[PDB]
Design a protein around this ligand. Structure first.
Ligand code: MG
Ligand code: MG
Ligand code: MG
Ligand code: MG
Ligand code: MG
Ligand code: MG
Ligand code: MG
Ligand code: MG
Ligand code: MG
Ligand code: MG
Ligand code: MG
Ligand code: MG
Ligand code: MG
Ligand code: MG
Ligand code: MG
Ligand code: MG
Ligand code: MG
Ligand code: MG
Ligand code: MG
Ligand code: MG
Ligand code: ZN
Lengths: 173, 224, 157, 129, 88
RNA sequence: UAAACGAUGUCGACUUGGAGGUUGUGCCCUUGAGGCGUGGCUUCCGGAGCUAACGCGUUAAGUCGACCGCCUGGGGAGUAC
RNA sequence: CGUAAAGCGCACGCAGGCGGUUUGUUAAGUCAGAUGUGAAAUCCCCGGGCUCAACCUGGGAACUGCAUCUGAUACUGGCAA
């Protein structure tokens, strides 16, 4: 029974799309202290650094056999290694959260990283935001020092996907 | 092994188009997404023939050297080779393991001397620090030569993972007439290999598939 | 049991800070006198050690030649670097007709009756290599019949 | 320009063997067909065929034995510049008879052995060993 | 080079039919017409050697075609050389 | 007349690849961008092969074919007549 | 014949050299056979005589050629398509 290699492999292509940026769920086979072996099943057990799998507390919230959704980078960098990274998954989830929060008009905490001529740059879950300088506060707050490094809640006004910037301000209240 | 069995493990993937050896054209089904797809229709029958020849070799008291030094598959190769009363190399292949077998014999003699000494005694005739130093030397030698420490003579066949990764061993084998069965990915050169098994050589699951088939056939030949 | 013949000994030199360091090279050929011949080349500070290294190397790296009653199967040309050698089968009684470098190789190989001549550079080290290659590519009627998918007389007769 | 199509055929054979090609294809001709026929009958090639009517393509399926080309050396002798003719008693033999010399006689193309046994001489097309 | 209309006229004049643009007669006729036209250009620009090379090329090609035509069919050759006033 | 140099005569045929450039052209994605081919010229790596090596390597210095131009120790000398 | 001596500075082009594929015909080249001739001696083979050899000598082979005649027609050439 010569069930065609073409048909059999075509079904796998139905189940596998070798394209960078595509999100595929993979199973961790082994967990090392510095690397995590995720066998998503493309060319090798991808050794994603364990630092990515640490939360804000530095703990591994994953176990042996856990499935995690990872974004595709490539197939082999000269040594046959499939490159995968949990950080890009973080990025995807953060973008989805921001996109839904704009529809929800919800407020998210963020830390003002710096200031520019047109306003300020904030950090929201690792994503850069612009806060209009004229819209930082209702009162003419001369004290620009206190508004640095503190977690303040902002609402997404204009979410920009082409420049990877999010327009935020102290709305709602 | 089954065509479905290999396809499930993903044997069919290969390296990129830009990194390939033209001599592997017959075994390449084609390309998709700028990545080569190996022909498993070539893989399965050749693997069975390799199993048959390895069965004959193992049935005539043949010595089989499992060789693969990829960091991904070294542990699997060690365990699989030990499971079948055979020999392995799981760390960096030393250039001249076969052609400089005389010097490797000197190293094996050193290993036997060290462990015989460390169990008979004379460490009580040595400063505790000298004892620890000689123990460290023994440990390093054991790591280096543990898989071949009891091989005794020239091996009767080589099984190789990633022919390109282990080309040095393939070169010594070619010079010494030792038959080489090798997992040869699309990017590697199959000329030096007597029995080329065309398939993925990275994925630990596929490596384990090949090795499990090899070990089963070897045990069949051994039991008699 | 194998017979070994030293073809040439030469002194080389390497220059270092203190001056010239003298060494020696040895070219030897071993043979079974029945169609198996190997050649070796060794280096050492002294001549006996160089010759012994050459002998050890010569015992390996040896090949088989399908002789025919002490003579070649058919005329053969060999080529290595600038040494072009020509050999042809000869009738009984001719003996070994060849230059010294080819003479030693053929004698230790067992070719009893051969006509040979070296063209171009007579450098012994390359003449030996070209002779060995020529004798190696020389095929036999049984092997050519096997290749062509016929019998011996089907080529001979 | 192209001036020896038999040389082109021989060179195609030689280069395809060197490149380990399974088969070779060339513009056909009756002389090429007869030379391929004698080569096949002497067992230096597997088989041959001709395809087409207006621009016939002749195809030779080569043969390998031990990862080696069965045809070791194929060389034109009577090149267009210098034609080489021999009499029945002057017909050369290649590799002391191990090879074959292709002869064009008054009775068609045949090997040196056949020409000698039939008492004829002719043009030495090429040597094959 | 030559305009489409003059070439069409020459083709009709010297060809068996309009589709025939490869007959030796029409080829020679086109070559002759272009040679005659270029004569003025080289009459004024005597130092235009690069173009003079192409003029020599077309002259030589016409010579070769005329030799072939003469050896293959004398009657058409005589007719053509009379009609074009050539060989003299 | 020149280191008029690629120090590589002209033309034809066969022989694994890769990364570029430049200039046409076909098909297809929803086309712009973008993906599949198919020609010309051209640069750099590199296998077989070849070479004394250096290297050349489908634009060969590989494998052959046609015709032509030269070469035969250095100096005297591209000099004397 | 890239660097050791050796590719004209480059292109066109007459004489000359070579020439895609099919059919017919020709017998020029080519091949086969035969005839004549290729002086004798010399070289070579089998023998013979000087006590051996040199030397002399019998028969033969050879003298690869040239010319003529009758044949073969694959290849090259001529002619025709
Ligand atoms: Mg050596
Ligand atoms: Mg010389
Ligand atoms: Mg024009
Ligand atoms: Mg001058
Ligand atoms: Mg000059
Ligand atoms: Mg210049
Ligand atoms: Mg320049
Ligand atoms: Mg010059
Ligand atoms: Mg020219
Ligand atoms: Mg290169
Ligand atoms: Mg002068
Ligand atoms: Mg020079
Ligand atoms: Mg030039
Ligand atoms: Mg002609
Ligand atoms: Mg013809
Ligand atoms: Mg005649
Ligand atoms: Mg006479
Ligand atoms: Mg007598
Ligand atoms: Mg006599
Ligand atoms: Mg004819
Ligand atoms: Zn690999």
């Amino acid at each position: 029974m010569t069930e065609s290699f073409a048909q059999l492999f075509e079904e796998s292509l139905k189940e596998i799309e070798t394209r960078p940026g595509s999100i595929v769920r993979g199973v961790v086979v082994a967990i090392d202290k510095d690397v995590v072996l995720v066998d998503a099943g493309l060319k090798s057990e991808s050794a994603i650094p364990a630092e990515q799998f640490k939360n804000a507390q530095g703990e591994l919230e994953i176990q042996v056999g856990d499935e995690v959704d990872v974004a595709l980078d490539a197939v082999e960098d000269g040594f046959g290694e499939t490159l995968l990274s949990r950080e890009k998954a973080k990025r995807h989830e953060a973008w989805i959260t921001l996109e839904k929060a704009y529809e929800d008009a919800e407020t998210v905490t963020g830390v003002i990283n710096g200031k520019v001529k047109g306003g300020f740059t904030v950090e929201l879950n690792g994503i850069r935001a612009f806060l209009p300088g004229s819209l930082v506060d209702v009162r003419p707050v001369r004290d620009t020092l206190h508004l640095e490094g503190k977690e303040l809640e902002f609402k997404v006004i204009k979410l920009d996907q082409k420049r990877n910037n999010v327009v935020v301000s102290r709305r709602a209240v | 092994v089954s065509m479905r069995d290999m396809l499930k493990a993903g044997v069919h993937f290969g390296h990129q188009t830009r990194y390939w050896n033209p001599k592997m054209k017959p075994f390449i089904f084609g390309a998709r997404n700028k990545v080569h797809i190996i022909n498993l229709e070539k893989t399965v029958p050749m693997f069975n023939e390799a199993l048959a020849e390895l069965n004959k070799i193992a049935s005539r008291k043949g010595k089989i050297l499992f060789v693969g030094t990829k960091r991904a598959a070294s542990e699997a190769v060690k365990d699989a080779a030990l499971s079948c009363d055979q020999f392995f190399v799981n760390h960096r292949w030393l250039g001249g393991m076969l052609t400089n077998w005389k010097t490797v014999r000197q190293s094996i003699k050193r290993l036997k001397d060290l462990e015989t000494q460390s169990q008979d005694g004379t460490f009580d005739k040595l400063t505790k620090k000298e004892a620890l130093m000689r123990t460290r030397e023994l440990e390093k030698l054991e790591n280096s030569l543990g898989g071949i420490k009891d091989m005794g003579g020239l091996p009767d066949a080589l099984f190789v993972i990633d022919a390109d990764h282990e080309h040095i061993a393939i070169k010594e084998a070619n010079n010494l007439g030792i038959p080489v069965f090798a997992i040869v990915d699309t990017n590697s050169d199959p000329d030096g290999v007597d029995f080329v098994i065309p398939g993925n050589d990275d994925a630990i699951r596929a490596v384990t598939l090949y090795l499990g088939a090899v070990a089963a056939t070897v045990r069949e030949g051994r039991s008699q | 049991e194998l017979q070994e013949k030293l073809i040439a000994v030469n002194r080389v030199s390497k220059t270092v800070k203190g001056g010239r360091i003298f060494s020696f090279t040895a070219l030897t050929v071993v043979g079974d006198g029945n169609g198996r011949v190997g050649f070796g080349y060794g280096k050492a500070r002294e001549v006996p050690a160089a010759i012994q290294k050459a002998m050890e190397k010569a015992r390996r790296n040896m090949i088989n030649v399908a002789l025919n009653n002490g003579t070649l199967q058919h005329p053969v040309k060999g080529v290595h670097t600038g040494s072009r050698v020509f050999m042809q089968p000869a009738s009984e009684g001719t003996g070994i007709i060849a230059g010294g470098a080819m003479r030693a190789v053929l004698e230790v190989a067992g070719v009893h009756n051969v006509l040979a001549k070296a063209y171009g550079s007579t450098n012994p080290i390359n003449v030996v290599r070209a002779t060995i290659d020529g004798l190696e590519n020389m095929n036999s009627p049984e092997m050519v019949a096997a290749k062509r998918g016929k019998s011996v007389e089907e080529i001979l007769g | 320009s192209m001036q020896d199509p038999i040389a082109d055929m021989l060179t195609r054979i030689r280069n395809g063997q060197a490149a380990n090609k399974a088969a070779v294809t060339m513009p056909s001709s009756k002389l090429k067909v007869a030379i391929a026929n004698v080569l096949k009958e002497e067992g230096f090639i597997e088989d041959f065929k001709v395809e087409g009517d207006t621009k016939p393509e002749l195809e030779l399926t080569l043969k390998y034995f031990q990862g080696k080309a069965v045809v070791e050396s194929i060389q034109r002798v009577s090149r267009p510049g210098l034609r080489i003719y021999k009499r029945k008693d002057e017909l050369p033999k290649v590799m002391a008879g191990l090879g074959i010399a292709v002869v064009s006689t008054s009775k068609g193309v045949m090997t040196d052995r056949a020409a000698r046994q039939a008492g004829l001489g002719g043009e030495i097309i090429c040597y094959v060993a | 080079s030559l305009s489409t209309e003059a070439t069409a006229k020459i083709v009709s004049e010297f060809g068996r039919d309009a589709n025939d643009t490869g007959s030796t007669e029409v080829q020679v006729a086109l070559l002759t017409a272009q040679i005659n036209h270029l004569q003025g250009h080289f009459a004024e620009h005597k130092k235009d050697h690069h173009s003079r090379r192409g003029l020599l090329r077309m002259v030589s090609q016409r010579r070769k075609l005329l030799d072939y035509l003469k050896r293959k069919d004398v009657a058409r050759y005589t007719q053509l050389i009379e009609r074009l006033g050539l060989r003299r």
